[PDB]
Design an enzyme around this catalytic site. Structure first.
Site: not given
Ligand code: NA
Ligand code: NA
Ligand code: NA
Ligand code: NA
Ligand SMILES: [Zn+2]
Ligand SMILES: [Zn+2]
Ligand SMILES: [Zn+2]
Ligand SMILES: [Zn+2]
Lengths: 273, 273, 275, 275
Positions: A81, A168-169, A196-197, A199, A218, A220-221
């Site tokens: 990534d 992101h976040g 993306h992003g 979360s 995607n 992650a957070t």
């Protein structure tokens, strides 16, 4: 078995669901994901950023995924990534990885294309699928449909990350997602689209983006917040506690709830056999 | 490369040092150990108990050690600590492990011997070394020299764990180590001797046990206390923190101090090349 | 690295060359092919049929190819040629193979399609590419010649990555110069955009194979000529060395004869310097 | 699983049998040996010399043996026969081999010892067992016969796991019945407790090999007879099939001839049903 995502995202595209792509860090975070995916019969992508591999090197993450593929009886797509260099991706593909994202999105179009193309040419010679990005997350900040068509034509990428309002976040305010732009991109781009992003994006918005062509989501957070939050609570209640079998498992179990929530939104349950 | 400890403990015996045997749990705990051992040129044994493998299965611990062997350019001895069943050891040796402890020490002598012998016969056919125990840690509680001679003769074990006053975990009072009994065992037992329960034993006592024939020193508790203590502190100071690259590294670094202390006591620095 | 042929045959198609696909048997035959492909910088496909793997099992051939991949620093594509059932292909893909041919060509259309589709569904979940065949191989009528419109429908219904066509070639040697149905090939290419595969290429004139590549062939399968050259050289060595016994000599003489065929086929396929 | 021979030769020693050690070349030769060892439940050592690995590289032989280990569900011991330098042995042990022979027997005692010791030090750090040789092979004087007291000192100074003795055997066929120095063997065994190894066992009478095992031989090396049987069968097939070309036929005929030798050697070594 370690595999690319070429067929996988095409299947998602054809059947109106998305594959959840979870950022991983170590054995317990991989295992937490696979305990849920195996139970829910969901495909998954396991992703690491360059910073990921500064903690546990790719050779060890690869070894873990290879063993977990056997343990859970499923081929696994390990994914690079937000990688930024041809040399680094080359090393990691030689080490066995078969999906990569080359992110040149902070470069002007021509330089993004040149970088991405160099990565596509190498990766396809290695049976590695390639994601790239046009538009920046967070003008420069929204993907133009005709530019995205040309970008894919000049690069030959297998999938395309778009900029339609995610970041992101966590979001400080509910994000605004440009569904009309997404629809326009999908009309002129045939390769699977990537979000993306995700979360902290409302489930109803993610669901709509999959109806309009998103094939990969995607996250992650939210995984890290859940895992860590549970470990923190465990040490607070267990000041003399010290066995990772206990504290890492409470992290895993909190993370698993997030994984199930994302499989639900992505519509990916019962898509493998 | 994954190897047995047959030559390794013989070298320790011949050169008056001991190999530290550290109980591991996951990628970060293995890596913490190997960062120090590689720097100090120390041999090491990486051990897991049956409970260890209920958290991360042996197939994944094996895969990690195989990759870490390449990463740190050293063959690695993965070791089954306090295993109790021939069937379970068979499965784990088939999965690739080449050192095992079969602990029948809570059985009467004859039944301990029968169990251990069944494990030796299988393991030697697989090029796997075998440790066993005579005497219970914590009469039944101290190893008899002539009994230990007979035990080794009837079993054919490669190494022998003895009971001379150590105990698993922390000690409530400074332990009393029976150095004279140790010396007597060494006079009549030729196979390498193993010291369990070494966490919280004064360094001067461990050093003396190595002068008198201990070749392998097992440490578990001190590693966990250090790791966990550091993670606990990190969450206290970072209530919103969530990235394992940060919190697991502070655990690793606290653990590394213990690893260096144990290499120092064991005299194992600069014993490999 | 062991890989599929999905990108490989697309590059061949786009650049007007074909990848030679050589049937292999054992270490020496793989090695002879890679020696030449390495020096000519040619892609290659290494193929085994069910009968091959009854001599040296797939797990051992796989192990050899994996090791040779490292030795030659090149990903390699191992391929199941003329495999016939899902149960067998599933085990061999689980054993590591990433390119398969499901040959349902003996069955009527619908049965062919159902079989192939079961294999494509499985194989694509494993990142394994799939070749299948419509029409039967054999020189010069309907059973033996792929129908273009049927071919279109077949590829649509099954989802295969490549299509083996039936246009007058045959496995083995030809008793007379084959008649190849170039027009039919062209008409298939018209309506089928997936890479096409030519079986039976031993003993076909170079001119003819070249023409099929101009008309859309992306993969050229060669088995018989390799074995005739290997065996003929070994035969002659034994006649020349009636007390000889060291396989390092006689297997190398066989290798070297087979290497001449491999070079010739790389030349006809136009695959040199495509890596 | 790929293993060393340390426990293996100790079991042979304790039970008065020897493990047959067969030189191999490729897949078919390994496979022929394992077919027989499997059915006779015999341990075996698979050996390659430097010249072997210049034909098919160690990495490929290793890969085959690893796969055959799984296929036959048996750990296998691959062995470097007559290797000569530390640099080469180090690479081949790093490539996975766990049994090696360092042959320093051409050099004077002290040079022999220094070379062997360098290899033992390395190999034991890798859990690889080490064979070495004192005295030179060849039929019937001092260079060609291991001195018992020198043997004692040699094993003490080097730390080897097994010792190849020089007692009148020779590689290859014998022009007349060899004279084996059984007394010398006995005197070596008297003062050397590590497993002993018999080289040159092709063409030695069964009675004699049996006697050497009674006197302490734990490993019997056979190469030449395997190749003569393989090649002789292939020779005869080609004469019988002047148009024949399929290696699945002729390599199986060679295998089957070699399997007869393998059985004979398991019989003489007493290794059946020792697994
Ligand atoms: Na977000
Ligand atoms: Na303790
Ligand atoms: Na033909
Ligand atoms: Na001989
Ligand atoms: Zn992202
Ligand atoms: Zn213990
Ligand atoms: Zn064919
Ligand atoms: Zn020899």
């Amino acid at each position: 078995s370690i595999i690319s995502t070429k067929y996988l995202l095409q299947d998602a595209q054809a059947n109106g669901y998305a594959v959840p792509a979870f950022n991983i860090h170590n054995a317990e975070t991989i295992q937490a994901i696979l305990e849920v995916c195996s139970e829910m019969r969901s495909p998954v992508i396991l992703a690491g950023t360059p910073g990921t591999f500064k903690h546990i090197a790719l050779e060890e993450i690869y070894a873990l995924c290879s063993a977990y593929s056997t343990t859970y009886n499923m081929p696994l797509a390990l994914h690079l990534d937000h990688h930024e260099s041809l040399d680094d991706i080359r090393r990691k593909v030689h080490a066995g990885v078969r999906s990569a994202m080359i992110d040149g999105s902070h470069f002007p179009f021509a330089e993004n294309v040149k970088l991405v193309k160099s990565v596509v040419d190498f990766c396809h010679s290695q049976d590695c699928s390639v994601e790239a990005e046009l538009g920046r997350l967070g003008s420069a900040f929204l993907t133009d449909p005709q530019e995205a068509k040309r970008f894919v034509e000049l690069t030959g990428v297998d999938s395309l990350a778009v900029a339609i309002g995610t970041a992101h976040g966590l979001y400080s305010k509910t994000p605004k997602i440009d569904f009309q732009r997404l629809a326009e991109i999908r009309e002129v781009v045939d390769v699977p689209l990537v979000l993306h992003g995700a979360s902290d994006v409302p489930d109803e918005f993610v669901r709509r983006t999959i109806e309009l062509g998103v094939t990969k989501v995607n996250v992650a957070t939210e995984l890290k917040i859940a895992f860590a939050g549970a470990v923190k609570a465990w040490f607070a209640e267990n000041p003399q506690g010290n066995d990772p079998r206990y504290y890492m498992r409470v992290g895993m179990d909190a993370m698993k709830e997030v994984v199930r929530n994302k499989i639900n939104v992505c519509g990916s349950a019962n898509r493998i056999s």
